[PDB]
Design a protein around this nucleic acid. Structure first.
Ligand code: MN
Ligand code: MN
Lengths: 62, 62
DNA sequence: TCGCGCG
DNA sequence: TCGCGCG
């Protein structure tokens, strides 16, 4: 699905750029912050990423 | 302002109907839930309403 | 001590 | 144990 494909792009972004906050990932994938966050939290449910518990949270690959 | 006027309508709604959750107020004022909540929390800052700490919160007049 | 992803 | 108002 297109959501899966968007998630793949987010994973590629983190692989290429290292740990990142949502606002940065959103600017590069070119999606609004809420949409990026929807994907980041699904990716966390699916054990592909984790967040740092900072505010703002820092995201990276599992 | 129009925001003030919207807030007045929400207050009138609570005066006429008694304590209410946001979803109910939204349906009657005919505004989306987020907009109603924006107003309810401003009205709380301005000491005109309070919420019950229930989930969903129940709102009423101070 | 805004974290918010919420369907 | 969705509370979400967020500018
Ligand atoms: Mn908080
Ligand atoms: Mn909670």
């Amino acid at each position: 699905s297109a959501e899966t494909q968007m998630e793949r792009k987010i994973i590629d972004f983190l692989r290429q750029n290292g740990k990142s906050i949502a606002l940065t990932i959103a600017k590069e994938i070119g999606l609004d912050k809420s949409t990026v966050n929807r994907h980041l939290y699904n990716l966390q449910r699916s054990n592909q990423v984790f967040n740092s518990n900072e505010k703002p949270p820092v995201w990276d690959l599992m």
